[PDB]
């Protein structure tokens, strides 16, 4: 029910979708309307 009523997680995945769609521009994974659950564990892979 907490996952059903989580409001901040749509806002978070919208921000991650905007950042990823900026990041993978010019690749086949760009212009994505969504992603899987396992994107969150792969967030720390792209390092500065």
């Amino acid at each position: 029910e907490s996952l059903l009523t989580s409001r901040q997680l749509p806002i978070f995945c919208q921000l991650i979708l905007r950042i990823g769609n900026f990041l993978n521009y010019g690749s086949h994974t760009g212009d994505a309307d969504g992603f899987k659950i396992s994107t969150l564990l792969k967030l720390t892979e792209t390092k500065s």
Binding site: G26, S27, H28, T29, E45, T46, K47
Partner: protein, 371 residues
């Protein structure tokens, strides 16, 4: 342009330049962290010792293996291993040299995703390649076909390849190799009263295993000989100056390779794994695999393993056809030698993985490109 061959094995990373015979940089894959307190201010007390420095100063270092059971578990440690093997050992820029790498069979795909992303985002290369270790070992044996039992530090896997076609269903994997033999050797040395509990002591017991252990040709006769006469006892000098003497532990430790019930595993020995790999092949091509039993990995360095292996397969297989064991003396580095063979080929220019392929197809073109 000279390529680089770098087998990132579970035990020791073996790297060097392509087109050569021997790897220039052989060093164990450990990350050593100090567990005590520093009091001496200055002189470059670096917080994480990698490789040979971690081996030399190991008496104050908790040692961690980034590759456990052929799987890269810790990733930052593996990045430190790659940084040391490129910048400190070879001292070459990655952006001007191709880098061949190796991998275990039946690996997870996301492992290949992560290795591709590290080899194209952090350590940028012009090109790179991931190959199966058994395939490169068969290439360094000079034969296109054959069955390879590769036994490293964590994985003993059987792979039969017929005419370059590596059969996927017949590949199997047994999680019993050199580190398990070292842990069992720690366990059985306590019967003689020698205690080895720390990770620093694992290198000493591993050196004992490398220097003194050997595969028995018959186990029960070696029990009878060891219990009867103390002729096979051998002495070893520890780094603190103490001298131990070991008896049957020279051949009870590799016998776990043939009897996994010592450490409590229900699966049988590597011979039954080889034989059950052989029945998974077609009946036409089984004859070629019997005469082409190739070994690789340093767990096959014990100087009684070939005749015992031929005895075990000849007991298992029907005796109507020929059994032959391919055991070259340089089969420790045959993964690296096969990589050096494969890197300097004129055809191999068109199977390179470019940065343009990486940018077009993510870190995922390695699945559709390689086997």
């Amino acid at each position: 342009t000279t390529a680089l061959v770098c087998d990132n094995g579970s035990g020791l990373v073996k790297a060097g330049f392509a087109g050569d015979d021997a790897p220039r940089a052989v060093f164990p894959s450990i990350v050593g962290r100090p567990r005590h307190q520093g009091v001496m201010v200055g002189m470059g007390q670096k917080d994480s010792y990698v490789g040979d420095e971690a081996q030399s100063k190991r008496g104050i270092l908790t040692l961690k293996y980034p590759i456990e059971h052929g799987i890269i578990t810790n990733w930052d440690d593996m990045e430190k291993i790659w940084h040391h093997t490129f910048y400190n050992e070879l001292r070459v820029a990655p952006e001007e040299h191709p880098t061949l790498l190796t991998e275990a069979p039946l690996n997870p795909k996301a492992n290949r995703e992560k290795m591709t992303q590290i080899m194209f985002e952090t350590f940028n290369v012009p090109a790179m390649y991931v190959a199966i270790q058994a395939v490169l070992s068969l290439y360094a044996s000079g034969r296109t076909t054959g069955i390879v039992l590769d036994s490293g530090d964590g994985v003993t896997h059987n792979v039969p390849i017929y005419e370059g076609y590596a059969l996927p269903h017949a590949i199997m994997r047994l999680d019993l190799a050199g580190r398990d033999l070292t842990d069992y050797l720690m366990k059985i040395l306590t019967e003689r009263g020698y205690s080895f509990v720390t990770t620093a002591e694992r290198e000493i017991v591993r050196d004992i295993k490398e220097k003194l252990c050997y595969v028995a040709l018959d186990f029960e006769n070696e029990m009878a000989t060891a219990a009867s006469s103390s002729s096979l006892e051998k002495s070893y000098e520890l780094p603190d100056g103490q001298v131990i003497t070991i008896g049957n532990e020279r051949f009870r430790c590799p016998e776990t390779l043939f009897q996994p019930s010592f450490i409590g595993m229900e699966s049988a020995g590597i011979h039954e794994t080889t034989y059950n790999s052989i029945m998974k092949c077609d009946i036409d091509i089984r004859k070629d695999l019997y005469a082409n039993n190739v070994m690789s990995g340093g767990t096959t360095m014990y100087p009684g393993i070939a005749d015992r292996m031929q005895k075990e397969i000849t007991a298992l297989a029907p005796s109507t056809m020929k059994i032959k064991i391919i055991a070259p003396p340089e089969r420790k580095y045959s993964v690296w030698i096969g990589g050096s063979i494969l890197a300097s080929l004129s055809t191999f220019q068109q199977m390179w993985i470019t940065k343009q392929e990486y940018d077009e197809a993510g870190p995922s073109i390695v699945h559709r490109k390689c086997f």
